[PDB]
Design a protein around this ligand. Structure first.
Ligand SMILES: CC1(C)S[C@@H]2[C@H](NC(=O)CCC[C@H](N)C(=O)O)C(=O)N2[C@H]1C(=O)O
Ligand SMILES: [Fe+2]
Length: 328
């Protein structure tokens, strides 16, 4: 198996005001997006050691009782309002992965989209503060930390494409973003349940089959265990791990907007029997956000693709991903 070219890009100029230095970052984002589709963001400023520590304490200390009380409706029929936010249980001897998903902390009962019961909007559920002291506080602050990094990255992508730096970021707002954090535990198990291992057409043992992300971009922290592969014309290539940087890739909304100039890379997760973390932030816009598609390859930039509102894209995309690769 070949190893993928995944450059490390110092993103710190995107937080400053040296415009030429921003353009040089933008050029590297362009190059990576038109090659394998992945890069690592370094010099991001986020304390990822604390992220990993706090996430481990939560996963290792939560009990079955608490998991039922937080479960999404796939696992608890009482919770008809929890389609996205909450706990995604493992099934001993059958499904190894488990995860906790939370949304914009500004989604409260006061919020007008919650009042209106608009699809894909939900109010977060949290464990009891006395059993997990400080967890909710940490997780809400992490949301805004990685929101900040993602805003900067979106300025980078706008400049890469020849647009003003707020082209994408103007639609990525704290009052209405549909972005999500998912805290995924991949356990060590001995014996490892055979039902939790898929075999690929090429013979590779997999935890999660091929997919495109439902996002604009995906901002991923993982612990230092190699697992991801990206599809190329010549076959799948391994992405090297780096537990100090963020792994960045486009989702299928970016491929729509750019007439596939920036593809959403197809990627998959190899089976590895090791205790590890996978912590994505899916950069999603607002429910009514629409960007006119364009084609960077043409001088006029005109594209025959139809504009698509983000909320419709997301509702369809989240269901399709379940039907294709299973309930996570
Ligand atoms: C490869 C990934 C990073 S991405 C892939 C898979 N992704 C999803 O199911 C999308 C979750 C969306 C979330 N509930 C929401 O409402 O926004 C997952 O989990 N996987 C991760 C993994 O297994 O590491
Ligand atoms: Fe993915």
């Amino acid at each position: 198996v070949s190893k993928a070219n995944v450059p490390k890009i110092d993103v710190s100029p995107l937080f400053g005001d040296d415009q030429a230095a921003k353009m040089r970052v933008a050029q590297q984002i362009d190059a990576a997006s038109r090659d394998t589709g992945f890069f690592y963001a370094v010099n991001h400023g986020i304390n990822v050691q604390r992220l990993s520590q706090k996430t481990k304490e939560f996963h290792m200390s939560i009990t079955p009782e608490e998991k039922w009380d937080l479960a999404i409706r796939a696992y608890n029929k009482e919770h008809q309002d929890q389609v996205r936010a909450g706990y995604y249980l493992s099934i001993p001897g059958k499904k190894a992965v488990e995860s906790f998903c939370y949304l914009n902390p500004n989604f409260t009962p006061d919020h007008p989209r919650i009042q209106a019961k608009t699809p894909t909007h939900e109010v977060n559920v949290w464990p009891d503060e006395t059993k997990h002291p400080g967890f909710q506080d940490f997780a809400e602050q992490y949301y805004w930390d990685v929101f900040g990094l993602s805003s900067a990255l979106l300025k980078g992508y706008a400049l890469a494409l020849g647009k003003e730096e707020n082209f994408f970021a103007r639609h990525f707002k704290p009052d209405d973003t549909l972005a999500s954090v998912v805290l995924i535990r991949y356990p060590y198990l001995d014996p490892y349940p055979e039902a939790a291992i898929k075999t690929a057409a090429d013979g590779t043992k997999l935890s999660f089959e091929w997919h495109e992300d439902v996002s604009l971009i995906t901002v991923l922290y993982q612990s230092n265990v190699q697992n991801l592969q990206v599809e190329t014309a010549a076959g799948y290539q391994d992405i090297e791990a780096d537990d100090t940087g963020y792994l960045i890739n486009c989702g299928s909304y970016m491929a729509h907007l750019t007439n596939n100039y920036y593809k959403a890379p197809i990627h998959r997760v190899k089976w590895v029997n090791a205790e590890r973390q996978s912590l994505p932030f899916f950069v999603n816009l607002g429910y009514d956000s629409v960007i006119d598609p364009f084609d960077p390859r043409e001088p006029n930039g005109k594209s025959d693709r139809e504009p698509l509102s983000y909320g419709d894209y997301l509702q369809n995309g989240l269901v399709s991903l379940i039907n294709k690769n299973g309930q996570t």
